[PDB]
Structure formats: C-alpha cells, structure tokens
Amino acid sequence: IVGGQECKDGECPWQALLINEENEGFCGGTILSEFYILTAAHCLYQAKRFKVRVGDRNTEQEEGGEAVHEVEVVIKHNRFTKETYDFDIAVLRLKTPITFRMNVAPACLPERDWAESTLMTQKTGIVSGFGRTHEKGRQSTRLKMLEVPYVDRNSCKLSSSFIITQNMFCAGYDTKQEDACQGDSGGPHVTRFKDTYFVTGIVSWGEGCARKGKYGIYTKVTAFLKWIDRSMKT
Amino acid sequence: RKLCSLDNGDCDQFCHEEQNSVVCSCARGYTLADNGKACIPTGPYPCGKQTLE
Numbered sequence: 222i223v224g225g226q227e228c229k230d231g232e233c234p235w236q237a238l239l240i241n242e243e244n245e246g247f248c249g250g251t252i253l254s255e256f257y258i259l260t261a262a263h264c265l266y267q268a269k270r271f272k273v274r275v276g277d278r279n280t281e282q283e284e285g286g287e288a289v290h291e292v293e294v295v296i297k298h299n300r301f302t303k304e305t306y307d308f309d310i311a312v313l314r315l316k317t318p319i320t321f322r323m324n325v326a327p328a329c330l331p332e333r334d335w336a337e338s339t340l341m342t343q344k345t346g347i348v349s350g351f352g353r354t355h356e357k358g359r360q361s362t363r364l365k366m367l368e369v370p371y372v373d374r375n376s377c378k379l380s381s382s383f384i385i386t387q388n389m390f391c392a393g394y395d396t397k398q399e400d401a402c403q404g405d406s407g408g409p410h411v412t413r414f415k416d417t418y419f420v421t422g423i424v425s426w427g428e429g430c431a432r433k434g435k436y437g438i439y440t441k442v443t444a445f446l447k448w449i450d451r452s453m454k455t
Numbered sequence: 456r457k458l459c460s461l462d463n464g465d466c467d468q469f470c471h472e473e474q475n476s477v478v479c480s481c482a483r484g485y486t487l488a489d490n491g492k493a494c495i496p497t498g499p500y501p502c503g504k505q506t507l508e
C-alpha cells in the first residue's frame with residue numbers, strides 16, 4: 222500500500238495473509254467465512270506450498286491474536302488466464318475453522334444488482350494489505366489500508382496499456398501517490414455502507430504502483446457471486 | 456428518485472423493487488428487523504463489522 226494509513230486495532234479484521242514455507246507473506250486474502258478465504262488466482266502461482274494467517278497487523282512481533290491455518294482445498298477459476306489476468310479469482314477452504322475474535326472477522330458478500338448500483342456507485346472503496354509501500358520499496362511490516370475512489374470505466378480503459386475485461390474494474394488516483402502495490406494482490410477491496418463493509422473487489426494488478434495516468438485494477442467480485450457461492454459448497 | 460433509488464429505500468442493506476414496492480433483505484448472519492428494514496446480527500462477530508472487543 223502506497224500512502225494510506227495503518228489499519229488501527231480491529232479496523233481490518235477480514236484481512237488474511239498467504240505465507241510461504243519460509244513464513245513470509247506473498248499475497249493477501251479476504252475472510253469470507255470460518256472455512257473460506259477469497260484470493261487472486263494469480264497468487265496460487267507464487268508458492269508450491271503456503272498457509273493462511275489471520276489476525277496479523279505487525280509481522281515484526283506477536284500480539285497474540287494471530288492464527289495460522291492450513292489449506293485443505295484450492296478452488297481456482299477454470300477460465301483464469303495468466304497472459305491478461307482475466308478471471309483472477311480463487312477460493313480457499315481451510316482444514317480447521319477460523320475462530321472469530323478481535324481483528325478476525327469476515328466481510329459480507331453482497332447481492333449483485335444492489336452492489337453494482339449502490340455500492341460501486343459510491344465515491345470510494347477501501348483496499349488493504351502488507352504489500353510494498355513504494356514501487357521499488359520493500360514489503361510493509363504493518364497492515365495498511367487506503368481509501369481509493371472508483372474510476373470511470375472509459376477513462377480507465379483509455380489509460381491502460383493492457384486489456385480491461387468485463388471481469389475487472391478500476392480504482393485509485395490519476396496522479397496522487399496512493400495505490401496498492403506488489404504483495405497486496407489477492408487482498409480485500411471493500412465498500413462501506415451504513416457502517417457495514419461488503420466485498421467489492423480482489424486486488425489484482427496495475428502497471429507499476431501509483432504511476433501517473435495509471436490506476437489500480439481489481440477483479441469484479443460482483444461478477445462472480447454465483448461462482449463464489451458454489452465454491453463455498455464443495 | 457424513486458424506491459430503492461431514494462436513499463436505498465430506507466433499507467439497512469439489500470434493496471429490491473417488487474411490483475413498484477421496496478423490499479429489504481440482509482446478508483447471511485443477519486435477520487430483518489420487525490420493521491422490514493433494519494438488519495439484526497444473528498450472533499457474535501457478524502460479517503462487515505469492525506471488531507470492538
């Protein structure tokens with residue numbers, strides 16, 4: 222996360238962290254329920270073996286609320302294409318259930334029509350993670366969050382050197398130095414409505430980080446709700 | 456500005472327009488209040504809420 226602020230105590234409870242065999246986070250995720258994590262399909266290419274950590278905010282010490290969970294099954298969208306990042310969505314089922322507590326709670330999945338008309342037409346959304354703080358920077362040891370405005374679909378298609386499919390959407394700033402970055406992928410993009418937060422995207426990609434004239438690209442979760450629902454029953 | 460387009464139809468969460476009428480609903484883990492608008496958490500740590508303790 223470039224710019225933005227530190228997630229304060231209990232502010233980003235749905236954040237999950239994919240960790241490799243060496244215990245270093247390499248991607249993010251969103252807690253959907255006691256047994257399921259939502260992440261990016263392109264992340265399942267960042268490690269031969271990995272686990273999920275929840276309740277973490279400062280990887281440099283142990284607050285005590287952290288919990289590591291092993292993955293029982295990985296459900297990747299069959300249509301995922303690495304060349305363009307289309308269908309960048311995956312669901313993970315944990316071997317053991319997550320015990321909700323301070324800094325550990327799930328984000329709400331919305332209904333398609335209501336979300337696209339009322340949630341996604343809001344001014345901003347919130348993105349978070351342990352990713353880089355600068356394009357050439359190092360990973361953050363603190364969990365960060367940032368308010369990212371929704372970006373006009375046309376203006377975004379125009380600004381990108383790559384294809385923006387119907388399974389993606391854009392958010393961020395044209396010139397302002399705030400945006401997600403490497404390591405935040407798979408992480409949560411949520412929108413707040415009357416003090417309740419709903420999942421609206423999955424950190425997917427961008428051309429660099431916070432570059433002028435470039436935006437952050439997220440997987441359009443509203444386009445995969447039926448898919449997510451089916452995966453959470455298999 | 457009519458129905459679900461007029462302040463989310465006074466619903467806490469999901470709003471659906473049926474027969475020119477507003478019908479409210481909630482996310483899993485919540486139950487619609489007696490006023491058919493508000494959403495009541497079913498148990499501890501309901502989705503979408505920041506943790507206070």
Ligand SMILES: O=C1CN(S(=O)(=O)c2cc3ccc(Cl)cc3s2)CCN1Cc1cc2cnccc2n1CCO
Pocket residue numbers: 304305306383384400401402403404406424425426427428429430431436437438439
């Ligand atoms: O420049 C970056 C930055 N990294 S990153 O890991 O640093 C990210 C930056 C960033 C910024 C914002 C958001 Cl929402 C997500 C991310 S991931 C992703 C891949 N790329 C290159 C890239 C994007 C992209 C999109 N479609 C097709 C091919 C693509 N490539 C490879 C060719 O350069």
Ligand SMILES: [Ca+2]
Pocket residue numbers: 277278279280281282283284285287
């Ligand atoms: Ca910690």
